Amino acid sequence: DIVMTQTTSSLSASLGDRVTISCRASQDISNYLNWYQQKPDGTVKLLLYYTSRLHSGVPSRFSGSGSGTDYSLTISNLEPEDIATYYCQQYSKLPRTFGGGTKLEIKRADAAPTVSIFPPSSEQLTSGGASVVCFLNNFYPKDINVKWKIDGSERQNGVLNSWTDQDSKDSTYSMSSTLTLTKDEYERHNSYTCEATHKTSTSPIVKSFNRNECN
Amino acid sequence: EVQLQQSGAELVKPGASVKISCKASGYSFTGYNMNWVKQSRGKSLEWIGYINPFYGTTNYNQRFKGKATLTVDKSSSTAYIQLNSLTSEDSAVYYCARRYLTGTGAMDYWGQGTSVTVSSAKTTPPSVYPLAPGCGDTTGSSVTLGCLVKGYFPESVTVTWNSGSLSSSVHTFPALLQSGLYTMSSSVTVPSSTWPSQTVTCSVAHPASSTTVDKKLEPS
Amino acid sequence: NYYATLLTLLIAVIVFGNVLVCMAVSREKALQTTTNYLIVSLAVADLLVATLVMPWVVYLEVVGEWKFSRIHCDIFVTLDVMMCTAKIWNLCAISIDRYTAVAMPMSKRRVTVMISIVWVLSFTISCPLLFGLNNADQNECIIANPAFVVYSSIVSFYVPFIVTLLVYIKIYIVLLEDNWETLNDNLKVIEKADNAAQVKDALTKMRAAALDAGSDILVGQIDDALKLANEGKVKEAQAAAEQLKTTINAYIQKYGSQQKEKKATQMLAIVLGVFIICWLPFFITHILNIHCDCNIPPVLYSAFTWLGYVNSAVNPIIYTTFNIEFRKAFLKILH
Ligand SMILES: O=C(CCCN1CCC2(CC1)C(=O)NCN2c1ccccc1)c1ccc(F)cc1
Numbered sequence: 001d002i003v004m005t006q007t008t009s010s011l012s013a014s015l016g017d018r019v020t021i022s023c024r025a026s027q028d029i030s031n032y033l034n035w036y037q038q039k040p041d042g043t044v045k046l047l048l049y050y051t052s053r054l055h056s057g058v059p060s061r062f063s064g065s066g067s068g069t070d071y072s073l074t075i076s077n078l079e080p081e082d083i084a085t086y087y088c089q090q091y092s093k094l095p096r097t098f099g100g101g102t103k104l105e106i107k108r109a110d111a112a113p114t115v116s117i118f119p120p121s122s123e124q125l126t127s128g129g130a131s132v133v134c135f136l137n138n139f140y141p142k143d144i145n146v147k148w149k150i151d152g153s154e155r156q157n158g159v160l161n162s163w164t165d166q167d168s169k170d171s172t173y174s175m176s177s178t179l180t181l182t183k184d185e186y187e188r189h190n191s192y193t194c195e196a197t198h199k200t201s202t203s204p205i206v207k208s209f210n211r212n213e214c215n
Numbered sequence: 216e217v218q219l220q221q222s223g224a225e226l227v228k229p230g231a232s233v234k235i236s237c238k239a240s241g242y243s244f245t246g247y248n249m250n251w252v253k254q255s256r257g258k259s260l261e262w263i264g265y266i267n268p269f270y271g272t273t274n275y276n277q278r279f280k281g282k283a284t285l286t287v288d289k290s291s292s293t294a295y296i297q298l299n300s301l302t303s304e305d306s307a308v309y310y311c312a313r314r315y316l317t318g319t320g321a322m323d324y325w326g327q328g329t330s331v332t333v334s335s336a337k338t339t340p341p342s343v344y345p346l347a348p349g350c351g352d353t354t355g356s357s358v359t360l361g362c363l364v365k366g367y368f369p370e371s372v373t374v375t376w377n378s379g380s381l382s383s384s385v386h387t388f389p390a391l392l393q394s395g396l397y398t399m400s401s402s403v404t405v406p407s408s409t410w411p412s413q414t415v416t417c418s419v420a421h422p423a424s425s426t427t428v429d430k431k432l433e434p435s
Numbered sequence: 436n437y438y439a440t441l442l443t444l445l446i447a448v449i450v451f452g453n454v455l456v457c458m459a460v461s462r463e464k465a466l467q468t469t470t471n472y473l474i475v476s477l478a479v480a481d482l483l484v485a486t487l488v489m490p491w492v493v494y495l496e497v498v499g500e501w502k503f504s505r506i507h508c509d510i511f512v513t514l515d516v517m518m519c520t521a522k523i524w525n526l527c528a529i530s531i532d533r534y535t536a537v538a539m540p541m542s543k544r545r546v547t548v549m550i551s552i553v554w555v556l557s558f559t560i561s562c563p564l565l566f567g568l569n570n571a572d573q574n575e576c577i578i579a580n581p582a583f584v585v586y587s588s589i590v591s592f593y594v595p596f597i598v599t600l601l602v603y604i605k606i607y608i609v610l611l612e613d614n615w616e617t618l619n620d621n622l623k624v625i626e627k628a629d630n631a632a633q634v635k636d637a638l639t640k641m642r643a644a645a646l647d648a649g650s651d652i653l654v655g656q657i658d659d660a661l662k663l664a665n666e667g668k669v670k671e672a673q674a675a676a677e678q679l680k681t682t683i684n685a686y687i688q689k690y691g692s693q694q695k696e697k698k699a700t701q702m703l704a705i706v707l708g709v710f711i712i713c714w715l716p717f718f719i720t721h722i723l724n725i726h727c728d729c730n731i732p733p734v735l736y737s738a739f740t741w742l743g744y745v746n747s748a749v750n751p752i753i754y755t756t757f758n759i760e761f762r763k764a765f766l767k768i769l770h
Contacts, residue, residue, distance in 0.1 A: 032319075032320065034318065034320070034321045042308065042327065042328050043325070043327065044310060044312070044325040045325075046315060046318075046321060046322065046323045046324075046325075049315065049317070049318030049319075049321040050318060050319075053318070055315075055318075055323065085258065087260055089260075089262075089320075089321075091319060091320020091321065091573065094274070094276075094500075094573055094574050095262050095276040095277065095278070096262035096276075096320060097261075097262065098259065098260035098261070098262070100258075100259055101258050101259065101260070103258075114357075114359070116348070116359040116361075116402075117349060117352070118346035118347065118348070118349060118361060119349055119350060120344075121344040121345055121346070121363075123342075123344055123345075124342075124344045124363075124365075127342070129365075131344065131363055131365065133346050133361060133363060133400060135359055135361060135386070135400075135402050137359065137386060137402065137404070160391055160393060160398065162388040162389055162390075162391055162399070162400070163388075163389075164386060164387070164388055164389070174386045174388070174402075175388070176388045176400045176402070178363070178398070178400070180393070209349040209350055209351070209352060210350070210351075213350050213351050214349075214350035214351075214435075215350065215435055243581075245581060246580075246581065248572050265572065267572065267575065267577070267579075269579075269581055269724070270577060270724075270731075270733060270736065271730065271731060271732060271733055272575065272577070272733050274500060274572070274573070274574050274575060286730075287730065288730065289728030289729070289730060290728045314572060316570055319573065320573055
């Protein structure tokens, strides 16, 4: 059981740049390594075998190198078709094992998130549930932090967080944060706050509503 | 032209078994060994094993022994993997792949994958909740409206805004498990002057429960 | 784990039996003949099978995964195919030597030639495997190419088996004291004859008696001698009768050598039969797998592989049961 390690799971690169993806074998796999590509649609493609040998039908932008336990894939210039997840696999001994995977993102200008907050619908309150929702739209990089505050105090349990993949149009990210409470707990507090820290701002971005000023 | 077409997605109750197929076209089937590989929700890959189609012989990853059963049908030139005693850890995508003869230990041609979901949840239509700007929430030039789709099963809900007319400023967020059922949300953005003067409606469509819910967003 | 020790016992039995055959022919001069030389070559082939190849096949039957290098598997599969092809071509050469001995009983250079041809052809047939043409996947060891399976079945099994069957058919095609007495009496009658009527009558009786023996050169020579007597050529008829005596003595010698060799011929025939019975299901299942797309389980493959390997141990038993000098040499070398 040779454990393969890919150093960075995510990796951002400007278009037409030199990209290098490292892959460390848990032991000397003696240059018995292959590189596969998986596109967003799940399709898997064989790119390299024997650590340096191009498969049929792959462009010369790709090149492999490495020895001992350290190996690397290299894209000379990054084209948009090359935005995918790259996996390294060792066949030095059975079982064949893979690396964790390294997914490519396009590097782009920083972008502050647009933050919107929404109280629970009446229809949900009649179910005894209460979801407060926070949309953080069109930001970059994807490194963002979201805290939920009820009457000034932070809440951890009952918070669901969903990110989108990088946008096809503006290469931004978006996320939704949902605070799910029972109606009983919801009606016992007043202020609901969605606080977002992002590199684009030194001050947190705060969006709040008071339950008693609603109709 | 080589092609490996796998069967449809599977929604199996835990404890049961399932049998995925992988039909090959474009080469001599009995020559190229057929590998089977797993990809968990965590995007990590695992070599389940391989089968020699000529002699029917198999070589397994010792981790999958007794969990997977590889078979072939030379007549239909089709590989099969059978997973028995299914648990939550078994729900993943399963790929078949062809042994690259030139490259030792490499698979050159893969299938499109087969999703397998182990769950003891019944088909449940979704609850569509409208998300309108807050109580005393001051709005700018743009206004973001939303729809929260809560408590459905199985996956593949489709959300559109104004029957598809609003597409530009739409964000659809992937669903997540919550209390054993799926939840997702969608957002759209329009100029403030256009809403609520020009209707905005979200349409959620759950084929599995044969259900569609249209919710028209209204202020307050 | 189960069959592990059992086939280890089979390997040991094969080795012992073939070493016994080799020694028995090596030291005892009653057995030192050309056909028995070919038999010893066959025994050496079976010994090489049991020693070099069968241990790794037992290893694969035990662990189920070939855990050694690709060149290792290629080399020993080459040895397997070469030794089996050598076995079947040695059987063919033995059939050819039996045909020669029975048909033309009228010398070791031919034996050396046939032995070398057998081994040269077997190595030629098995060469491609050591050159990396066997592209076996990881942790598996088979003949990984169906085309080479077909080629090996054609040149290594079907051609030698068909040729050997035809040669043994020719041998079975080859299948009277008062007649020889009558022939010799009329020969001496012609020898003491002094006219043409006596010679004509004696040659008539000789042709009548010679139908039972021939199929015929003797009958044609009697007819030629018979034309002489109508013309009254007594001296020429007597010379033809003297050459007729030569032909008759040659017939006696030939059918004596034939009666001597028939028993060893039958023993080798039953050896060939046992070989075909042992190795037939293997190729039957191979042809099924190829031209049927039959989903054949590997259990049948292993069972028929070992059914064919069992033949490597039954040849000493046949030599013991169907031969006298072989059993004597066995009992003597045992004590
Ligand atoms: O070539 C043959 C016999 C071939 C049967 N041998 C083929 C190869 C074999 C063993 C049986 C198989 O099947 N799995 C595994 N393996 C193997 C080979 C080498 C090392 C370890 C395992 C032949 C037989 C009769 C004849 F008349 C002419 C040729």
